[PDB]
Design a protein around this ligand. Structure first.
Ligand SMILES: C=CC1=C(C)[C@@H](Cc2[nH]c(/C=C3N=C(/C=C4\NC(=O)[C@H](C)[C@H]4CC)C(C)=C\3CCC(=O)O)c(CCC(=O)O)c2C)NC1=O
Ligand SMILES: C=CC1=C(C)[C@@H](Cc2[nH]c(/C=C3N=C(/C=C4\NC(=O)[C@H](C)[C@H]4CC)C(C)=C\3CCC(=O)O)c(CCC(=O)O)c2C)NC1=O
Ligand SMILES: C=CC1=C(C)[C@@H](Cc2[nH]c(/C=C3N=C(/C=C4\NC(=O)[C@H](C)[C@H]4CC)C(C)=C\3CCC(=O)O)c(CCC(=O)O)c2C)NC1=O
Ligand SMILES: C=CC1=C(C)[C@@H](Cc2[nH]c(/C=C3N=C(/C=C4\NC(=O)[C@H](C)[C@H]4CC)C(C)=C\3CCC(=O)O)c(CCC(=O)O)c2C)NC1=O
Ligand SMILES: C=CC1=C(C)[C@@H](Cc2[nH]c(/C=C3N=C(/C=C4\NC(=O)[C@H](C)[C@H]4CC)C(C)=C\3CCC(=O)O)c(CCC(=O)O)c2C)NC1=O
Ligand SMILES: CCC1=C(C)/C(=C/C2=NC(=C\c3[nH]c(/C=C4\NC(=O)[C@H](C)[C@H]4CC)c(C)c3CCC(=O)O)/C(CCC(=O)O)=C2C)NC1=O
Ligand SMILES: CCC1=C(C)/C(=C/C2=NC(=C\c3[nH]c(/C=C4\NC(=O)[C@H](C)[C@H]4CC)c(C)c3CCC(=O)O)/C(CCC(=O)O)=C2C)NC1=O
Ligand SMILES: CCC1=C(C)/C(=C/C2=NC(=C\c3[nH]c(/C=C4\NC(=O)[C@H](C)[C@H]4CC)c(C)c3CCC(=O)O)/C(CCC(=O)O)=C2C)NC1=O
Ligand SMILES: CCC1=C(C)/C(=C/C2=NC(=C\c3[nH]c(/C=C4\NC(=O)[C@H](C)[C@H]4CC)c(C)c3CCC(=O)O)/C(CCC(=O)O)=C2C)NC1=O
Ligand SMILES: CCC1=C(C)[C@@H](CC2=N/C(=C\c3[nH]c(C[C@@H]4NC(=O)C(C)=C4CC)c(C)c3CCC(=O)O)C(CCC(=O)O)=C2C)NC1=O
Ligand SMILES: CCC1=C(C)[C@@H](CC2=N/C(=C\c3[nH]c(C[C@@H]4NC(=O)C(C)=C4CC)c(C)c3CCC(=O)O)C(CCC(=O)O)=C2C)NC1=O
Ligand SMILES: CCC1=C(C)[C@@H](CC2=N/C(=C\c3[nH]c(C[C@@H]4NC(=O)C(C)=C4CC)c(C)c3CCC(=O)O)C(CCC(=O)O)=C2C)NC1=O
Lengths: 161, 177, 219, 160, 91, 148, 161, 177, 160
């Protein structure tokens, strides 16, 4: 993986140059947004349980999916479902706090579309659950950090779809 | 017809939920970049007739078979409708620069055009060439790098907006071809 | 209607992963971008162009690349006077870096196919320094100037999209047909020393009639 | 980078970032502009550090620039100062990264195998980097050259 | 612990094959090999499915590959799935 | 070609930047020769067909042009050269009319390639180009034999 | 794997026949060339490090590859590069001393083209490095033994290309 | 052989009339220049042999295939012919410096040199490299910025004269290729 | 030793010595007297070999005996020739063993870490052992010095 800083050192390194004023402006941008990323990750760490509970309650329950023959039917499937929502929230926080979605490329979205199309996991219900976590999470962390988490949840939704 | 505002609203209605934070943050960037957009549209409103005349004159000079007999720029009337159509294309591109979304350009002008120019026998590659000349001329006026015209504005980076205008001309060009 | 694959007690009994054997993560049946573009009879001119430029090499890599790839028929469409004027001097033999610039303008990192773009409009930098807008309006997907004609072709490191016509980069320097030369004097006294202005003349105290003015002294 | 190290860590533990690590990221992102000052000064004073460090290297170590030596000749000495320029650039990357991960992965992982494949004594390389450490500590403040000089100390510890 | 310090042929670790893995790197290769054993007919061990597919860590893929080729395996499809390529920093 | 080069490219640029001229020329002249192929009956009556007629003229001249650049018309015979007459029979397209239009395109092409066409007088230093003209007429009567 | 002897026993075995005069002529050929292959393997065993050093110095250094942007630009990638040249020299020696390139089919060329095309190792530079080893090695062992090593280095080059 | 005077006269003969005050004014700029060109010719003709030695030695340094066996710089004979060729090139360049026009330089050496080196197998890119090094060394002496020898001259602008000299060397290096 | 190698080999294969293996033992035990001749000659000519090899070493390579080098002075030069005496002894053990196992396990396993811990250029050691190779090949026959010289070549390939 890589954060915004490592990406700057990648571009400046792969040119062979040192750090010019543009790259220093990018590092200043990250170092301005630093503290905001920290407190957002603190709040999400605090309320992960409630984000997943509220988002499952809005998006998935009392429908064909948890009715028998839906994918969510049986305890094992329900627990796997809410487990996956936990992974999306956790890696979305990693992607926010790094400032670079390369982690989502390396450790989540790799082979996930082949997995869900192999099992028969509904893509659209997954996407709507992720968007439910996006709304609830943005409600907790506020406007600016909700925009940041919004680009990483939207990155995962673009990854699955 | 949809602006950037109604694009965010329509996307949020596909999501079937409240606007919240992040979409409004991108729209706040639209507002803070608003005066650059205003001055850019001012740069295209003023120099348009000249740009249109030059672009179509360049289209004829690059491809002299248009002025040749039995070409679509042959008759004087056909040259008139030619110049007017270049003017109207530039007009809806300017509307797409004010709106920030290409719904006005797609709904009013773009939809129904390929089939029209095919049904008239208008050569489409020549039209896309004229759209390309209006693209380069419009980006040169929008970046204050025109030779015959250099008007003073307070300095700043506007590359985002140039890519936006080039996206609309690219869109118009794509539709014809 | 939508059975969930379960070997034992999961549900219906469909074997796992909706296939004959209950296994997942099977070996990929797709091949590289160069191989799939080489297997088809069209895109032959692209295989020659990627062979010449050496962007064969970057497309063999396993990073996700989307190749916005024009057909063989499309390069025929460059024979318009406008298109033969713009891409005309690329048929001169020295021009390889310009072909590299054009073909790097067609390749975009990451994976951007159909329903990442349906509804929205996204702007991505290419392998070259330039940028392209990719959009999908009313089930139409277009990249820059020319619309996509065939939607997506999976090739194990991203996607191939097929396009009606060759894109142009926004910064394209057409190679000159004839090589340009600096102006030679041929008559130092009449051309160098006649067009040049003495300090006194530049004041305007002298009479005006200089025939020319010099902006440079070179070859 | 420190942020990268902090993540990977709770990722392999498959948990969120701890309180402690988030305080560490706060202290890092508040120490940012001081770091960018340091790498700004080492950026704009690179030729004095490479030249003067090369002078102190060749004056302390007359082995490699003697005849029948690895650094003998004008082109070989120029390649020697070219490598000192490389490690100066990597030290600046390690200063802005707040971690020696750039220094380690660009320059240190497998360095002994390379210079043993070139016939170069790597102890002369470590003496060169120590000379650039003395010059770079002459160009900075007290605590400042303590920090940057300790990045140089990491590179010395990897060469020895 | 980056496997490239102090390479053998005079270094007290007996010669072993040493990978370009960075400390804790996160790159992996999706591979398809086939294995026929040899030890089975004199060992009489229970049968297992030889033909598999897995994500091998990039740092140790080198050794796994050499080891498959040593025991007469045949490799079909090496893709790099997990990581990014030709990145000078950040794995 | 290393001798031809700018001269062969010059010829291709002469035929290419007169394309709308030659196409609309030969198709308008095709109609002029016979009034039965504009009337009710023949395929020039409907507007939709006329558009595909102009497109077919442009495609013939486009691939013909490619052959000059590509030396032999393998690019043409790869797709367009073979199986065209089967289509024109299977759609009721008249073949004598197409053969006439290809002949008119040929004559206008040679008159442009030798600058004897009064009206376009692009400035090139003079040379011998007869061989290349015979390659151009060679391609148009390859196709003109394939339409019939 | 197999040497020339094993290959003769393979053809004679798979026909069911015994060893006739032709197969004994092939074994006589190999047993004539045996000692030459032994001393060649001795010399290459002695000077492996100098072969790789002189061949990397001829083929790879001071070019775009070790300049930044190239695939050998870092010390990690340099060490992996010279590691691979070591393997090509060692197995080329085994192939020379067996008299049969089946070892190169089994233990080198297997999966390596997929590997290099996956990671981004340039094939051209690799081939030129192997040819540099061919010239240096032929200079050490002499004319005849250099022809033998030449067919095996050319076998590896034909494998990767 | 035509100097700047004969170039004015030939141009007036093609014009078929007399001289005229404009061409005479440019001639007054030439004659009014004068001893700048004199001292410049004195500078290049002074350090000429050493320029030839350094330039040819550097030319051998950039591609060692010349001194490699089978190269055209191999053996003493070829090296001597190399040095006298560089010397004669510099000699005709100094002639074009005094003349003010390339007529003396071109007929003697520009015309037919390419045929001769192609017939003898002399590598032309190496010759253009040698002419380029003599160009840079000769402009550095003509501006008196040479790092080994710096003689006293009363200061002024020798720049006008210098570009001219670079034009002559670019004429020779363009001619040999 | 070849006999030991043959054993351990079929022992890890858990079988009795094969038909092929026994023949190798026969060839070894018939080549015994020749080997003992060679190591007898290099044993009784060792003093002369250490001296002459050290002279050619220091005369070819004036680095290490120069002021500043490792081997500068009486005591240091004596230690240097002491090591050349060690490697001569080990080469004789490898000649009688018929295998470089004794040379490797007494002298080569972890040698680079020792001479890097001493500050000693190991290329100078390899040049010293090459000098002893030249002298010891001057003291033997054609095929004889081929054999023994190739044992020296093994030690040089371990140092480089
Ligand atoms: C009703 C019509 C109307 C307009 C046409 C604009 C015109 C306008 N532009 C600016 C202001 C500005 N306009 C630009 C635009 C430019 N950036 C460049 O690189 C180019 C030269 C140019 C775009 C082509 C910039 C950069 C500023 C800010 C200048 C600054 O603060 O330095 C301002 C001052 C107030 C502000 O900061 O927004 C005004 C009145 N505003 C209006 O109300
Ligand atoms: C809202 C969007 C909008 C447009 C984009 C135009 C498109 C358009 N153009 C024409 C019509 C026309 N357009 C052209 C233009 C051309 N002349 C040439 O030489 C070139 C090929 C080309 C300019 C690049 C000409 C010549 C006509 C008249 C054609 C004719 O009557 O023969 C017509 C038919 C009605 C008319 O005659 O005006 C329409 C709908 N009109 C619209 O309402
Ligand atoms: C990229 C676009 C491109 C072109 C369009 C050509 C244009 C072109 N033509 C010639 C040059 C020429 N072109 C022609 C052509 C002809 N002369 C006749 O009298 C006939 C009417 C006509 C038949 C085709 C001739 C005869 C020459 C000169 C002979 C030659 O150069 O072979 C040259 C040589 C340079 C010069 O003349 O200044 C060039 C560059 N080359 C290009 O690179
Ligand atoms: C690559 C080479 C290439 C060609 C040469 C063309 C050839 C061609 N023409 C048509 C099709 C057609 N071509 C014509 C043309 C004609 N109208 C007339 O009055 C004349 C007889 C004639 C022009 C001289 C017409 C009218 C059609 C449509 C026929 C119909 O639908 O009735 C079709 C069927 C598909 C279509 O409708 O477009 C094809 C393959 N297409 C190609 O891809
Ligand atoms: C018979 C031999 C003969 C010569 C060799 C020249 C030598 C010469 N040069 C100048 C004089 C000069 N010479 C130069 C020349 C230059 N100064 C620069 O800094 C450049 C390096 C260089 C470019 C050529 C300049 C600039 C002057 C002074 C300006 C001038 O007199 O025009 C003078 C004027 C008198 C004096 O200075 O004392 C003389 C006699 N004239 C001769 O009669
Ligand atoms: C972070 C890295 C990571 C992720 C994200 C991940 C996802 C993942 N989801 C899985 C299954 C599943 N995933 C779901 C998910 C859903 N069902 C619904 O209806 C919802 C709409 C939707 C979630 C929003 C279900 C039901 C299964 C179980 C399918 C089965 O095995 O029966 C499985 C198969 C293993 C198992 O759970 O039994 C994996 C491996 N794995 C990973 O290593
Ligand atoms: C960014 C990380 C990185 C480093 C550091 C690096 C070093 C590097 N050093 C090289 C050579 C060299 N480096 C040296 C260095 C020295 N000689 C001495 O005596 C001194 C102790 C020392 C200078 C302080 C010399 C002499 C050579 C060339 C040796 C030869 O070619 O014979 C080469 C050979 C080819 C080339 O330079 O283009 C590389 C690739 N490459 C990398 O990617
Ligand atoms: C025994 C048969 C065999 C071979 C040959 C083999 C090669 C092999 N080469 C590798 C990497 C590599 N190999 C190279 C080689 C080169 N770079 C260049 O520019 C040069 C042309 C060339 C050196 C001459 C490089 C740069 C890498 C690492 C690239 C990267 O990780 O980004 C890796 C990746 C992981 C690892 O090394 O541990 C393997 C497995 N494996 C095998 O089992
Ligand atoms: C049987 C295997 C074996 C070996 C080889 C061995 C070597 C050995 N070499 C030593 C020192 C040394 N060895 C050298 C050798 C050299 N200096 C040069 O410049 C030349 C390249 C080279 C001589 C050819 C020198 C100079 C020292 C002492 C260095 C010092 O003390 O500063 C020491 C330090 C203490 C002592 O000698 O008692 C040991 C133990 N020990 C062993 O058990
Ligand atoms: C002989 C037939 C003929 C023409 C007609 C022109 C037409 C023409 N204008 C261009 C492009 C162009 N045109 C203008 C507008 C124009 N310039 C000004 O400074 C003012 C005041 C203008 C209106 C009066 C601008 C600003 C540009 C961009 C280039 C520039 O910086 O000038 C381009 C370049 C297109 C491209 O980049 O792809 C062309 C072909 N060219 C021809 O060959
Ligand atoms: C009354 C119904 C009618 C027509 C319509 C014309 C159509 C026509 N054009 C011809 C041929 C023809 N046409 C042109 C093109 C044309 N001329 C130019 O100079 C320019 C600028 C042009 C496009 C505007 C050229 C260049 C030629 C070649 C003859 C020439 O040199 O002019 C030919 C001769 C065909 C042949 O040689 O077999 C015909 C029949 N004839 C008719 O009877
Ligand atoms: C390692 C292979 C090698 C060489 C050999 C040199 C060759 C060389 N001399 C130059 C140029 C050059 N050379 C001299 C002549 C020279 N200097 C003096 O002061 C005296 C007394 C001289 C003869 C003994 C001068 C005067 C210049 C001009 C630069 C200067 O002011 O010194 C230039 C610059 C060319 C240019 O400007 O385009 C080169 C390349 N360079 C190399 O890389």
């Amino acid at each position: 993986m890589q954060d915004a800083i490592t990406a700057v050192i990648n571009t400046a390194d792969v040119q062979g140059k040192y750090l010019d004023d543009n790259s220093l402006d990018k590092l200043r941008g990250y170092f301005e947004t630093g503290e905001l990323r920290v407190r957002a990750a603190a709040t999400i760490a605090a309320n992960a349980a409630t984000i997943i509970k509220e988002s499952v309650a809005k998006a998935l329950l009392y429908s064909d999916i948890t009715r028998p023959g839906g994918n969510m039917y049986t305890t094992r499937r329900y627990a796997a479902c809410i487990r996956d929502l936990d992974y999306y929230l956790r890696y979305a926080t990693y992607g926010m706090l790094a400032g670079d979605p390369s982690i989502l490329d390396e450790r989540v979205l790799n082979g996930l579309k082949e997995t869900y199309n192999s099992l028969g996991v509904p893509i659209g219900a997954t996407v709507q659950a992720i968007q439910a976590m996006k709304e609830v999470t943005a409600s907790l962390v506020g406007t600016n950090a909700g925009q940041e988490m919004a680009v990483y949840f939207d990155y995962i939704c673009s990854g699955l779809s | 017809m949809l602006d950037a505002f109604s694009r965010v609203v329509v996307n949020s209605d596909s999501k079937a939920a409240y606007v919240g934070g992040s979409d409004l943050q991108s729209l706040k960037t639209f507002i803070s970049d608003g005066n650059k957009r205003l001055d850019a549209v001012n740069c295209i409103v003023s120099n348009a007739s000249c740009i249109v005349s030059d672009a179509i004159s360049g289209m004829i000079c690059e491809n002299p078979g248009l002025i040749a007999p039995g070409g679509n720029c042959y008759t004087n009337r056909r040259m008139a409708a030619c110049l007017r159509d270049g003017e109207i294309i530039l007009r809806y591109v300017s509307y797409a620069l004010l709106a920030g979304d290409s719904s006005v350009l797609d709904d009013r002008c773009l939809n129904g055009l390929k089939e029209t120019y095919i049904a008239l026998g208008v050569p489409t590659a020549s039209t896309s060439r004229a759209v390309s000349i209006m693209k380069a001329a419009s980006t040169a006026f929008i970046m204050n790098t025109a030779s015959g015209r250099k008007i003073e504005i307070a300095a700043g980076d506007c590359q985002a907006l140039q890519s936006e205008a080039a996206a609309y001309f690219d869109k118009v060009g794509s539709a014809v071809d | 209607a939508y059975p969930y694959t379960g070997s034992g007690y999961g549900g219906v009994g469909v074997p796992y992963a909706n296939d004959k054997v209950g296994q997942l993560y099977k070996v990929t049946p797709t091949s590289n971008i160069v191989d799939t573009a080489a297997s088809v009879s069209i895109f032959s001119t692209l295989v020659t162009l990627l062979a010449q430029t050496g962007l064969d090499y970057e497309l063999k890599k396993s990073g996700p690349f989307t190749v916005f790839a024009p057909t063989n028929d499309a390069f025929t469409d460059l024979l318009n006077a406008h298109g033969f004027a713009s891409f005309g001097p690329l048929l001169r033999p020295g021009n390889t870096d310009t072909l590299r610039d054009v073909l790097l303008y067609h390749v975009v990192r990451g994976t951007y196919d159909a329903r990442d773009v349906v509804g929205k409009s996204v702007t991505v930098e290419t392998m070259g320094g330039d940028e392209v807008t990719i959009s999908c309006m009313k089930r139409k997907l277009v990249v820059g100037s020319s619309a996509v004609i065939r939607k997506d072709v999976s090739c194990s490191n991203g996607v191939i999209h097929v396009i009606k016509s060759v894109l142009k980069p926004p910064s394209y320097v057409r190679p000159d047909i004839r090589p340009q030369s600096q102006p030679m004097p041929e008559s130092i006294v009449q051309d160098v020393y006649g067009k040049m202005l003495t300090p006194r003349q530049a004041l305007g105290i002298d009479a005006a009639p200089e025939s020319g003015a010099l902006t440079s002294f070179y070859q | 980078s420190i942020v990268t190290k902090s993540i990977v860590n709770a990722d392999a533990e498959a948990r969120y970032l701890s309180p402690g690590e988030l305080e560490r990221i706060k202290s890092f992102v508040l120490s940012g502009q001081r770091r960018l000052r340091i790498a700004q000064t080492l950026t704009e004073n690179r030729e004095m550090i490479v030249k003067k460090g090369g002078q102190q290297l060749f004056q302390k170590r007359t082995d490699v620039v003697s005849p029948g030596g690895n650094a003998y000749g004008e082109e070989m000495t120029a390649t020697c100062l070219r490598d000192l320029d490389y490690y100066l650039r990597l030290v600046t990357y390690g200063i802005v990264a707040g971690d020696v991960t750039p220094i380690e992965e660009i320059g240190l992982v497998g360095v002994k195998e390379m210079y043993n494949s070139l016939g170069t004594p790597i102890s002369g390389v470590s003496e060169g980097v120590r000379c650039m450490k003395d010059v770079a500590c002459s160009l900075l403040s007290g605590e400042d050259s303590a920090e940057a000089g300790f990045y140089f100390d990491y590179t010395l510890g990897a060469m020895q | 612990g980056y496997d490239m310090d102090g390479s053998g042929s005079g270094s007290l670790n007996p010669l072993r094959i040493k990978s370009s893995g960075v400390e804790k790197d996160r790159r992996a290769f999706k591979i398809t090999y086939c294995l026929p054993s040899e030890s089975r007919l004199f060992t009489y061990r229970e049968l297992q499915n030889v033909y598999t597919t897995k994500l091998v860590p990039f740092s140790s893929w080198y050794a796994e590959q050499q080891r498959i080729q040593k025991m007469g395996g045949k490799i079909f499809k090496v893709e790099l799935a997990a990581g990014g390529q030709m990145r000078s920093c950040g794995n």
